[PDB]
Amino acid sequence: KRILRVTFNMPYGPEVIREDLDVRVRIMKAALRIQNRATMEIFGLTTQLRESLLSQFTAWKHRQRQVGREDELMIKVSVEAGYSDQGREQVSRVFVGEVAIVDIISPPPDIGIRIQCYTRQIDRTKTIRNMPPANTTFVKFVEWGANEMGLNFICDTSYNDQVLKNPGRSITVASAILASIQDMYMPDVAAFVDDDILIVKDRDKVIRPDEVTNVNSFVGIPSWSEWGVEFQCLFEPSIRVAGGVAVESLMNPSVNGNYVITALEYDLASRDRPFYIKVMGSPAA
Amino acid sequence: QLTTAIQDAQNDSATKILY
Amino acid sequence: MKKIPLTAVPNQAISFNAGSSYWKIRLYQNMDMMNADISRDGVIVCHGVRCFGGIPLLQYSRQYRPDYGNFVFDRDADWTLFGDGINLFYLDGAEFAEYQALATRK
Amino acid sequence: ANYNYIVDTGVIVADTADVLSDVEAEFRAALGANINLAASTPQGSLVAAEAIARSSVMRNEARIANTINPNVSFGTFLDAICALMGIERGSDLSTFGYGVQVTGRSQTRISTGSRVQTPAGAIFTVLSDVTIPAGGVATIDIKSQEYGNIPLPVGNLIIIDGTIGWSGAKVIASTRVDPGSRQMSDAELKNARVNRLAIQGRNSTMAIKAYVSAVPNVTSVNVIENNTGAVQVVNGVSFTLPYAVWVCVAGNPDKQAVADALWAAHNGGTPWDYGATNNGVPVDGPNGVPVRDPASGRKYVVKWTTPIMYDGYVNVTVQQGSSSVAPEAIQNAVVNYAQGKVEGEEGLVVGASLSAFEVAGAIAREIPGIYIKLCQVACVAAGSPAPAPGDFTSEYVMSAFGQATISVGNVRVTFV
Amino acid sequence: ANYNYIVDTGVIVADTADVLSDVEAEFRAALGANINLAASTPQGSLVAAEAIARSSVMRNEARIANTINPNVSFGTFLDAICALMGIERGSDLSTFGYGVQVTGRSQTRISTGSRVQTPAGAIFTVLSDVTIPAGGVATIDIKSQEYGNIPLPVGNLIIIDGTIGWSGAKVIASTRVDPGSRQMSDAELKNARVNRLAIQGRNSTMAIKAYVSAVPNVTSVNVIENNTGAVQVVNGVSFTLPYAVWVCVAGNPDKQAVADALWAAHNGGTPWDYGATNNGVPVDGPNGVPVRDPASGRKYVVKWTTPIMYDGYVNVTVQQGSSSVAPEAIQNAVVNYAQGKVEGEEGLVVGASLSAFEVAGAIAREIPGIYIKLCQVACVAAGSPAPAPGDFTSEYVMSAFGQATISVGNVRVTFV
Incomplete structure (x- = not known):
């Protein structure tokens, strides 16, 4: 019994959209500089709910007006998905981000909205309040970037003790910080933002050696790829991005091994068949 | 589809400074 | 003081970011008590900590110092009443120091 | 295969699925690579046995690993x-x-087990069979079904399970109601250990102050230790023996109670002293108060002094503000402050000097708006004529063994 | 099939193993008496596996039981x-x-901003500060590692700069705290435990020693008693007053904290004696650290001393036998033993005595098979040149007051 919630944050409070309404959330996260995205198709909206939500979602009041100094400029929405049977819940968190676009896909008799949320869409920040370090090592520049963005950081890499001259003095906004941390040292070590945690790590290392996920049940077949193992699965509320996987397949016996995660393809539909997550993984070292 | 990717490409090119 | 949700499962592992540290507590029923394996930032901290009400899980100083925090059970641990009746609370450095000062002069 | 489930960070206990898999792998390697390890087979029965074992021991070891630690035993x-x-x-x-x-x-x-009952629950079971004599009344022995100090007051016991002929039961005043007890919880045991540690983590003077302040009616206490090996004034009290401790107790508590507190907190070897003359009232005579040690029938004598009582007079010449106030309000504010009923300020405890500036501060904090012109203080011995005008000064300093008391009548308020 | 109990000499529960015969005799008389228990048979493999499992169980239980007492935990x-x-x-x-x-x-x-001193500084600036136009600023810094560090009072090196900043420096007014370090005291916790076996107690020589040792950065404490109060000299160090406790504290701790702990462990009314001129180095000459009594009253004085600093040397002659080259691990072993990292043999402490046999014993500890021949030691004061080869003897008395220290370069090793 799938349980999917879309929880907005508005002045009135959190208005949770449950799974009783036709909801369809397509999320795609990855270990890059690009903001992970979630498309949301929500049907069955009443007139009052539409007035409460769509009118709040806007791109104005920061271009033709001022009304902006901090958050509340755009509504931040989180996603809590999982399963529930025998009374126990499994609602994890699968996405946190701010809306940017809203449209309508289905006309009457079912007025269905389709919003587009991106992680860290608050790039309308204080244009870098604190100046970057003049000379500093990679780990300390990462710490400065995390502090500027307001997110806790996980810096686990072998390039931390390398000095830089002018590490990001052309940066204009908070979002460009991640692009810069990605720009320097891009054979392996790609930094990204997963929810509210900024992860800077080598591509062949697991953020968490103790949090390997043993996988034995797959939808379809766990296959090879030009990098690693690619496979789809039913929603397990224990698979993050950059996490370690311990694939143990039946159809393909030689894809077994330990892999790290590079991409993630959530497709959750409460009132439709697709409730799968697709994992791109590469060999872990 | 492709309109989603188009919207993504547009959102990439929005930052807080005009020049 | 942060309440860590629990599950009425005899053996479980809860993983969270609390107090600028990443904790992982594996609570399991051992004979007629509850034991916990506590790990912070990946590396293990303690194994098989017998759990009681009011006594911090991280007992020895270097595990909760400096300002690392601690975990406290309101009552004696019992997975049958987890979530509704028994809660595990996380205290940061200052809160745990104040709790220790309170409990060192009972 | 067994790894090392002991390690150094305490005993690591794995799941029974894992230990059963290890035992199954051991049996498969021993007997045959494709042996049927089904639970109904003899080999499966042996596997299940070796899986119940090798887990009972792990759980026992993890149960009693760090057992000498008292905090979590x-x-x-x-x-x-x-x-x-x-x-x-x-x-x-x-x-x-x-x-x-x-x-x-x-x-x-x-x-x-006739199971009589008290008026408020508390079922009691008869523990000895009896037969009523020709007089019609007899005596029985009853035991509380539950545990603890169950009350058995004098009264008419009601009968739950009664035979034919038994009229009633009463707790006469001759009944010896032997009380019970309700054991002691492990949390209470750890708590009592903490109490004992708190008691015995203190030195002489600190323990003296704590034990004698815990006594009721003790407003304040001044504890002084010579620690010089020379009969001299250290910082205000003239001692009389080279190695001694001197304690002054305010209030009017029970003499036996404070003496027992002194005795229970006594450091040992270092004797008490009454000080020299006029070093705090050496009450109870030249010889100290004797107390009986609760531990052994041997008595012990303790000596302590009450503060030199001083009567404090305060003259104020306040100018009335817009709002109307009565001089009784100022007098009561001063009296409350001196008694120490205000927050923050200690008041006129033993070894506390009497400052007209502090009195003016208290008068202001209780009565804002009025304008204070001049405040003066004076100190006399108890039961003595009030000081003449001009004797009042802006501040009176007191010794380490005196206490100043201000009554409502000792505050002379002038409305200028 | 037995648990040997070393009653007094080793205090250890030891497994006896030899359980395979017991397992074989268990299979016999239960599966019959004619069972072929020979190896390369299924029952033989079963018996071997069961014997291995039960030896492992006995070993684990013995280790857990032995963890109850120190020196083996x-x-x-x-x-x-x-x-x-x-x-x-x-x-x-x-x-x-x-x-x-x-x-x-x-x-x-x-x-x-990374900075570095001589002993691998690795010092960062806590928060960014912008230079004032005058050109002189003060920053707050932390140390990369978590070890007891002594920064030199001279600026040594910086890492990160815009090439405009000349250099940082350390002034006398700078606040330095020598920090505690995990345990590093891991084998010498067993040493420190015997000394601090009475931390929870007060008002005794052992309690005073334990509490002062518990104070951070206090490597060693020496506390004498004066039970016989007739001035004289008791256990070394002349005693001016009859009854007094003499305290010598090593390390580089904070005077206020050490004096507060010494006050907390006070013992009633026993004074503090640190005179006799050369006996120790007085902390503050006359009128030592005042501190404040927690039982609020007066400002007393706590008196202790710091040890006389000594510099030791070690001349070793070894054979480099058993075909195992080792050029400069010997001085590392010697300095480890002197610092007290070794288990059970506390090194050069305030009450130590530099022994040639002890140094040779530590060398034979850390690396056997070199056949130490000569291990002369001698020592001098904190300054002074080398004591010349004429002074190198087999022992130094190193009286109760004072403290020896062996440098890494003060050990000279020669191969014969």
Whole structure:
């Protein structure tokens, strides 16, 4: 019994959209500089709910007006998905981000909205309040970037003790910080933002050696790829991005091994068949 | 589809400074 | 003081970011008590900590110092009443120091 | 295959699925690579046995790994640890009422466990069969079904399970109601260990102050230690022996109570002193108060002094503000401050100097708006004529063994 | 098939193993008496596996049982024993301050600016500060590692700069805290436990020693008693007053904290004696650290001394036998033993005595098979040149007051 919630944050409070309404959330996260995205198709909206939500979602009041100094400029929405049977819940968190676009896909008799949320869409920040370090090592520049963005950081890499001259003095906004941390040292070590945690790590290392996920049940077949193992699965509320996987397949016996995660393809539909997550993984070292 | 990717490409090119 | 949700499962592992540290507590029923394996930032901290009400899980100083925090059970641990009746609370450095000062002069 | 489930960070206990898999792998390697390890087969039965074992031992070891740590111990282990400091867990007994009167008729026989009841619950079981004599009334012995100090007040016991002929039961005043006990919890044992540690983590003077301030009616206490090996003034009190400790207690508590507190907190070897003359009232005579040690019948004598009482007069010449106030309000504010009923400020405790500036501050904090022109203080001995005008000064300093008391009548308020 | 109990000499429960015969005799008389228990058979493999399992069970149980007593325990197991007596396990820290920085003009001295002193400094700046136009600023710094560090009072090296800043420096006014370090005291917790076996107690020589040792950065404490009060000299160090406690504290702790702990462990009314001129180095000459009594009254004086610093040398002659080259691990072993890292043999402490046999014993500890021939030691005061080869003898008395120290370069090793 799938349980999917879309929880907005508005002045009135959190208005949770449950799974009783036709909801369809397509999320795609990855270990890059690009903001992970979630498309949301929500049907069955009443007139009052539409007035409460769509009118709040806007791109104005920061271009033709001022009304902006901090958050509340755009509504931040989180996603809590999982399963529930025998009374126990499994609602994890699968996405946190701010809306940017809203449209309508289905006309009457079912007025269905389709919003587009991106992680860290608050790039309308204080244009870098604190100046970057003049000379500093990679780990300390990462710490400065995390502090500027307001997110806790996980810096686990072998390039931390390398000095830089002018590490990001052309940066204009908070979002460009991640692009810069990605720009320097891009054979392996790609930094990204997963929810509210900024992860800077080598591509062949697991953020968490103790949090390997043993996988034995797959939808379809766990296959090879030009990098690693690619496979789809039913929603397990224990698979993050950059996490370690311990694939143990039946159809393909030689894809077994330990892999790290590079991409993630959530497709959750409460009132439709697709409730799968697709994992791109590469060999872990 | 492709309109989603188009919207993504547009959102990439929005930052807080005009020049 | 942060309440860590629990599950009425005899053996479980809860993983969270609390107090600028990443904790992982594996609570399991051992004979007629509850034991916990506590790990912070990946590396293990303690194994098989017998759990009681009011006594911090991280007992020895270097595990909760400096300002690392601690975990406290309101009552004696019992997975049958987890979530509704028994809660595990996380205290940061200052809160745990104040709790220790309170409990060192009972 | 067994790894090392002991390691150094305490005992690591794996899941029974994992240990069963290890045992199954061992049996498969031993007997045959494709042996049927089904639970109904003899090899499967042996696997299940070796899986119940090799897990019972792991769980026992993890159960009693860090058992010498008193903070998180349990059961007999906690009892053994607590018995090192004399703390012993009690025994869970029950009330054992004897001689309970029973009224009936002829030769009615009361059987064991007749289960009488007190007016407020508390079912008691008869522990001895009896037969009523020709007089019609007899005595029985009852034991509380539950545990602890169950009350058995004098009154008419009601009968739950009564035979034919038994009229009633009464707790006559001759009944010996032997009380019971309700053991002691492990949390209470750890708590008592903490109490004993707090008691014995203190030095001489600190323990003196704590024990004698815990006594009721003790407003303040001044503890002074010579620690010089020379009869001299250290910082305000003229001692009389080279190695001694001097304690002054305010208030009007029970002399035996404060003496017992002194004795219980006494450091040892270092004797008390009354000081020199006029070094705090050496009450109870030249010889100190004797107390009986609760531990042994040997008595011990303790000496302590009450503060030199001083009567404090305060003259104020306040100018009335917009709002109307009565001089009784100022007098009561000063009296409350001197008694110490205000927050923050200690007041006129022993060894506290009497400052007109502090009195003016208290007067202001209780009565804002009025304008204070001049405040003066004066100190005299108790039961002496009030000081003449001009004797008042802006501040009176007091010794380490005196206490100033200000009454409502000692505050002279002038409305200028 | 037995648990040997070393009653007094080793205090260890030891497994006896030899359980395969017992397992074989168990299979016999239960599966019959004619069973072919020979190997290369299924029952033989079963018996071998069961015997292995039961030897492992016995070993694990013996180790867990032996963890109850020290000298055989390890992390989180010996620590239950330490916490039984309240000997704290112990933390880490690193933070400095006040470090001056002479620089160019309006340089942005940004956070975590890496700096380094002689012993691998690795010092960062806590928060970014911008240089004032005068050119002199003060920053607050922390240490990368979590070890007891002594920064030199001279600026040594910086890593990160905009090439405009000249250099940082350390001034006398800078606040330096020597930090505690995990345990590093891991094998010598067993040494420190015996000394601090009475931390939870007060008002005794052992309690005073335990508490002062518990004070951070106090490597060693010597506390004498004066039970026989007739001036004289008791256990070394002349005693001016008849009854007094003489305290010698090593390390580089904070005077206020050490004096507060010494006050907390006071013993009633026993004075503090640190005179006799050369006996120790007085902390503050006459009128030592005042401190404040927690039982609020007066400002007393706590008197202790610091040891006389000595510099030791070690001349070793070894054969480099058994075909194992070792050129400069010998001085590392010697300095480890002197610092007290070894288990059970506390090194050069305030009450130590530099022994040639002890040094040769430590060398034979850490590396056997070199056949030490000569291990002369001698020593001199804190300054002074080398004592010349004529002074190198087999022993130094190193009286109760004072403290020896062996440098890494003060050990000379020669191969014969």
